[PDB]
């Protein structure tokens, strides 16, 4: 855990401000910007964020 890490997927975000929107989409299994949906688990969300950077772009 850290000041730049999500409360659900335990992955990073482009900014500490978008990080608050990141967790609110992760709890529902969704990406905060490309709107893609998967399982609401860290294993599935990490697999998505490993290929997605629209999260703060
Ligand atoms: Zn997240
Ligand atoms: Zn995405």
Swiss-Prot record:
Tree of life domain: Viruses
Positions annotated as zinc finger (CCHC-type): 6-26, 31-52
Record membrane topology: Multi-pass membrane protein
Cellular localisation: Virion membrane; Host cell surface; Host Golgi apparatus membrane; Host endoplasmic reticulum membrane
Notes on the domains: The YxxL motif at the C-terminus is indispensable for the interaction with MAP1LC3B and for the Gn-mediated induction of mitochondrial autophagy. The cytoplasmic tail is involved in the inhibition of the host innate immune response. The C-terminus of the cytoplasmic tail is involved in binding to the viral genome and the nucleocapsid. Contains 2 contiguous zinc-fingers.
Main function: Forms homotetramers with glycoprotein C at the surface of the virion. Attaches the virion to host cell receptors including integrin ITGAV/ITGB3. This attachment induces virion internalization possibly through clathrin-dependent endocytosis and dynamin-independent macropinocytosis. Mediates the assembly and budding of infectious virus particles through its interaction with the nucleocapsid protein and the viral genome. May dysregulate normal immune and endothelial cell responses through an ITAM motif. Translocates to mitochondria, binds to host TUFM and recruits MAP1LC3B.
Description of how the protein assembles with itself and partners: Homodimer. Homotetramer; forms heterotetrameric Gn-Gc spikes in the pre-fusion conformation. Interacts (via C-terminus) with the nucleoprotein. Interacts with host TUFM; this interaction contributes to the virus-induced degradation of mitochondria by autophagy, which leads to degradation of host MAVS and inhibition of type I interferon (IFN) responses. Interacts with host MAP1LC3B; this interaction contributes to the virus-induced degradation of mitochondria by autophagy, which leads to degradation of host MAVS and inhibition of type I interferon (IFN) responses.
Name of the molecule in the record: Glycoprotein N
Source species of the chain: Andes orthohantavirus
Parent-protein residues present: 543 to 599 of 1138
